[PDB]
Curated annotation (Swiss-Prot), chain A:
Transmembrane segments: none annotated. Keywords: Antenna complex, Chromophore, Membrane, Photoreceptor protein, Phycobilisome, Receptor, Sensory transduction, Thylakoid. This is Orange carotenoid-binding protein. Its cofactor is 3'-hydroxyechinenone.
Length: 304, 305, 305, 305, 305, 306
């Protein structure tokens, strides 16, 4: 049994690979078209969904970068934003690249407000997207909201130029206030402990469920391998999620292993209750019940 | 009054029609998926519920069939099990079809031990169910244990093709002085009470006399079994060593001086004993002399029923 | 390769097995609840979808049965419809059972008109369904129209007992110069394209030559139909005037130099024409010379498949 | 003017971004599904299109790597090929990663021959792709052949593990007297015509002189390659034996006395010769002396671009 | 913002300007060649697409003109049709010029039937088109059908010379309960959806209220029609019994808090029904209160747009 | 008998360059700013190999007030003024533009082009990109022979403005008799045809018009026939000065009613480009029994092989 081989459990699960396909089409585009396109998507999405403000901590970490850009003349400001999209090698891009995903998003959240207010150079008035860019935005607006926000997030995290800065780790939720999840057909203690500890931000307890060499595969990314690496991923990116699993199925695997698939919804704190993402979890447990591998899949539709 | 019309007494009774619904989904599947799915369901269920071993008599009746399969090579052992699931017409299927449900079940119990042990071709390692099959197993594992075992039982009895009728020996009735008696809140009707008590006693010759000559018994999700001869045969082949635990009932008049009675409670099958209580309703239509014209037995949709 | 093993090609295809599961729930119900339920579904569906009238030939084949029922009193008329739903053994059921599906459907279409007009005993006024029957109708009305009409068709086809075999006359094939041809993204395979084109042309004699002698066709939720004669009989009795509108497909090698091809698209039945598009997958297993060893036709679970 | 800003000249040009989108869907897949999928695409494409054999030089550079895999047992051979697809870090993957695209492609061409013959572990018999994998192949088979081969090329080139750069020997330029010359409707620009003519002649040393020191070339779906040294290296490692067939173009002024030129036509890769015509656009940005500051090459979305 | 500046929203949209280009080529031809060319295209197109007969009203408004031509000798009949094509100034041309397009088209439809029957002077026997005319017809026959019928429509509408204004009677709006509603991927905008639904319903009075007072509608290849009065007149004279089938769209902000929306899909004219689907783009420029300041309708160059 | 419109069909095998009106129709669909950008682009690219002849003093003076009013406006309004001409909007500038002869309109735009180059009139925004349709239209124009290129640009320019007050340059006095060269045409000794060529090459319009029947017509390339001596003479005087007609070969055939039809092919040079653009032309004459021109069509030919 290998991690890479474990990637193939439950092969009928239809993942929303329109998300990675759409990101790839986006990445082909001219940098100004990327910027205009996100700007457009945001303004038109923002009419029905309201994004949550970035936390105080994240705002503080982005503040110097946000001030340096605002101080520059209007062309330099547009050049700085193109450099991020083109993944150019500048000091700003290196700083952007060391940020955690929440800070990159908080940074762009704030540039968007300043562009609305007119204090940072906005997208030229009446600008028109290229043929390819219009098709890419057309595709995004046809996606359900959960897939829409995942496309926008991933385009934003990909900017910059490849020390690592993240927000402070929130202390785990006090035990007496923890609700527990219930899953039709799934009484497996490891899976239930997986949801409950993640909903409580109790990463130290969560990581103990994994084998030493175990792996976690977030949506559309390569598996993250080893307790050290998976715990880091928890701490930098998985605070304040809300996991709402609904049903599951349990099957034996090779070597006395067990494979469990659960489907349900997740809410990210950036949108709270206004975007429910349809998610599947695919677990491969070893004979003592440790997680050897868990994949998280953004589902292609609710009919899955 | 007709048997088919009598099927409609107490129409608010909510039967667990999810059981026959799942069986219909199961039957669509590819034969190897059926076998894999039951094998999977068995292994995952078997961690918390322990199935009773088949009786010596039943084991004996299944032995010639079990040895021919074990003797064949692994390619043809799995072909033989697919022929059963596909309900193909082979000599093994013809003989399998003549068996009573308990013998069909014992046959498969024994293949399960040999597959675990590695002496009969097992489900290929790391086999993955098709989309429809995974959903079907997801549904099964979401059921109450009582509904799970009924889905599996009916899926198993359903295998084979389409003659001789082979069943275990009929056990002698329980001695009279050793019989306990049921008590039912709201129900003193002697016929209903004699029906429960004699079935808990395996006294099928006394039970059958409660029925009118043309009367019918409708087991869960099946067509009515009509006539004393057919209903007795069903008693003798499938209703031994049940435990009927009725709890409450209600009594109402029907047309023509008939009386209809509904009783709800639990039943224990000897395959699982006290570890699976099925929630059951019995629906009686009694004629004016108290004879059973019709009795339906329902697997209930939930404990709230 | 066996036909039964070929049933498992493209196991990811999610068929709409809610259709057979809903049929199984329907079949548990009291006969009068079946009749009421269909009657209700018909009235509510008929507000937005209009059923095509049965053909002259079919109307004539059912006419004798239709006049005998109308001549009976209102009690016996309702008895006659219950016998059909209960699958009772009567002359009417024996005659109904020998009819082709289109003739059964036309038979009921005409009973529905007479019930509207008040000339055949209707569903009692203000009749209320049983708990299980309400749940079944709720489920049906929640399905896409393609699945709704399939449930109703199969519930209707399953009535009667269990005799010749009566079907309408075979319509002659479409004139060659008038035939359009389908186009399928990713599929230039001559056998697949000739399969679609000849069925849209009702050219069954050409269609059947595409099959291996022992080949099989598996209609939605049915067992495979095996052998050229059996598959040809099926074409001639049930597959006239369909409209096949395939859209895209994928082509893969199979064992032993065989080829498996999956096609997805829509089909239109003449009973509803363009008002109901069913989402269909075809699964072909072609042998090395390109003949159809097996073709399964799947009603898809949703438009996302 | 920046190279990155120059990427946006002629924004109406619709590139075939289904190619990078399809590659991204491919990259999500399980390693065995990627391999099975390409193997499937190959067998089905190879019935109508024949790929050219790898050159002697390339075959020799791949020689020891192919023997090591062939010497291993069947499980380890399949592990070795998974390691390449999973982009695992093994010495073989490091070796594969140092090869030029033509050598990587020759490596896989030869594994395909051995798998057909049965001398390298093949895709398991009757293997079935996963849901996502079936959809990805369906998409590939619906593309124009020019897009198919580009998807396949790019998926294989991306295997391995992200040093020393091994490539085939550089073929000396075509003798001057046998060189044909292109003609382009509406385009007399000397630089553009010299770009086509010298690339068709494999005269990379002359070609590179058309570029400014800081100029860039952007191959289909890649980031620009910047600087004469980098662009020359790309010519020498990947652009031998192409056939460029430009047809029409348009010339417009740009900022600062620059000139922007778009040309459309076809290209043939030596792997397929005249059997795959790719529809290509070239987008030139020339400085005032006629040097190429930027040239993008686009795979067009269809023949009407 | 001006109407003329708004004409440039979504400049990447490639309209089928081969249509106005071939009409311009047609307009150069000798009058008899125009008539022969249409006569030829009509006969050759009419083998696979059949035109809808003009309505009772339309036939009635053109009747007096059609009866005068039939009364003249064959020489003068041909002179009269030449006068129409040459845009000569005669009383017949003045009356033809006052007709709405549907009346002009119905007029020629009927001349086409009389010419076949031999009652109106036809295209001379064995006539051969001029060099330019043959090229023009070749171009037309190479166009997709949506573009063919548009070329023919516009050639016909352009004949005559050069108050009053005659059109058919206005069809009353479709009653509210029978109206279907369109759905557009990515477009929930109330104004865009109200635009489609009211036009598919012929509810021009509700439709026109969607426009700003100074707003404009630009039909395919025409100058924008400006002001509610002019746009309403256009709706009433030319846009009855269309069928709008929008499929997908994209929404972007414009200057001044405006919004621009592009939608692509198909339309059906009642002249050809479902046998010709034209590929259409709609381009909306909406002001902050959601009103249509500008809407352009484009015939698309191909299905790839 | 014979009508002007029927006479349009003589020598129907003549293949005219109908790509020219086809491209003009494609041009006219475009956004107004695209039309202006496109011509500007075509102009700069053509201007590397062909140089336009300067407008005459008279024409410049007639366009002078119009050009001064535009230069005085701000850059936003200058561009508005030019869009109004392309959009054929109704402004005083458009009404004045429309009353001008073709040569004055062309001189108007020649001069705006110089001021745009210099930066004194609002130029095409830097790095502007044409729309998809406009790019295809420019590609087509650059694929045409130069004779067809300049005809497309001429006609797009003449079409601008807004639908009598008719302004033209002064009429040049006819060439002195002793200085007139005469043409020679292989296969054509017809006195009317030869006098037609010789008098047009001499700007002797009063003599030319006497060659026509009273009801005769002249049909310039891609336009409707101009009918009647007064109308045809007006056309000569406003648009046909300083041409050079170089006929080469012809063919002579009888027509109905004792008429004669003659087709001549050759080249013509306009004074805007002189000898740097030869247009390939056919003339199609329908002559009555006394030798008068009932109808003469002038065709821009599709290629040199026609
Ligand atoms: C970039 C840009 C602009 C700014 C755009 C902005 C502000 C975009 C912001 C978008 C955001 C906030 C999107 C948020 C997305 C969040 C997502 C998709 C979170 C998903 C998390 C998932 C699904 C979690 C799954 C997990 C589960 C359930 C587990 O069990 C294990 C952990 C794991 C994380 C995998 C503007 C300024 C608008 C224009 C400018 O030109 C360019
Ligand atoms: C029964 C009843 C009543 C009457 C009900 C009526 C009139 C119901 C009528 C329903 C009908 C007309 C349903 C029509 C269904 C037709 C279907 C679903 C046809 C599907 C055909 C398919 C999917 C074709 C597939 C094929 C393809 C594409 C192939 O490639 C091979 C052939 C094959 C057939 C498999 C009333 C009178 C209303 C009340 C009464 O109490 C009881
Ligand atoms: C990977 C694998 C398998 C093997 C697969 C094989 C052998 C696939 C081979 C595919 C190949 C040979 C594809 C080749 C494609 C070549 C293309 C797309 C070349 C295009 C080049 C272009 C467009 C050139 C453009 C250029 C122009 C015109 C310029 O002006 C500048 C240079 C530039 C290169 C950009 C098998 C063994 C079958 C199964 C196994 O499980 C996995
Ligand atoms: C002329 C002639 C002959 C007769 C020719 C005939 C009868 C030809 C008839 C052709 C017809 C019926 C063509 C009809 C064309 C219809 C079209 C192209 C309608 C298209 C309308 C569209 C695209 C609607 C678009 C709209 C939408 C979608 C909106 O949202 C707003 C309104 C608007 C109308 C713009 C014959 C007799 C054959 C020979 C003789 O010598 C000469
Ligand atoms: C419009 C504009 C711009 C300016 C463009 C300019 C200056 C264009 C100028 C083009 C010119 C000078 C074109 C000239 C064309 C001349 C032609 C094609 C004349 C042909 C005459 C012929 C063929 C004569 C034929 C005749 C003969 C032979 C006869 O026998 C009888 C008389 C007749 C006239 C018919 C700029 C400023 C560049 C950009 C701005 O955005 C927009």
């Amino acid at each position: 049994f290998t991690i890479d081989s474990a990637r193939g459990i439950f092969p009928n699960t239809l993942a929303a690979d329109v998300v990675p396909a759409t990101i790839a089409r986006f990445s082909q585009l001219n940098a100004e078209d990327q910027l205009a396109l996100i700007w457009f998507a945001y303004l038109e999405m923002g009419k029905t969904l309201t994004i949550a403000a970035p936390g105080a901590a994240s705002m503080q970490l982005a503040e110097n970068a946000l001030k340096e850009i605002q101080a520059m003349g209007p062309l330099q400001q547009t050049q700085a934003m193109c450099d991020l999209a083109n993944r150019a090698d500048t000091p700003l891009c290196r700083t952007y690249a060391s940020w955690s995903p929440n800070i990159k998003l908080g940074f762009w959240y704030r540039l968007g407000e300043l562009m609305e207010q007119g204090f940072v150079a906005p997208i030229p008035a009446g600008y028109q997207l290229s043929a390819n860019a219009n098709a890419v935005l057309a595709t995004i607006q046809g996606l359900e909201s959960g897939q829409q926000i995942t496309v926008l997030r991933n385009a934003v995290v990909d900017m910059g130029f490849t020390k690592r800065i993240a927000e402070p780790v929130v202390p785990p939720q006090d035990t007496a206030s923890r609700t527990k999840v219930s899953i039709e057909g799934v009484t497996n203690a490891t899976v239930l402990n997986y949801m409950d500890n993640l909903n409580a931000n109790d990463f130290d307890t969560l990581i103990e469920l994994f084998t030493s060499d175990g792996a976690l595969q977030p949506p559309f990314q390569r598996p993250i391998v080893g307790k050290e690496n998976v715990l880091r991923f928890f701490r930098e990116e998985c605070q304040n999620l809300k996991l709402i699993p609904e049903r599951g199925v349990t099957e034996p695997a090779e070597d006395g292993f067990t494979q469990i698939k659960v489907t349900g919804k997740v809410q990210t704190p950036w949108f709270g209750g206004n975007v429910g993402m349809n998610i599947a979890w695919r677990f491969l447990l070893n004979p003592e019940g440790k997680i050897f591998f868990v994949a998280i899949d953004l589902l292609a539709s609710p009919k899955e």
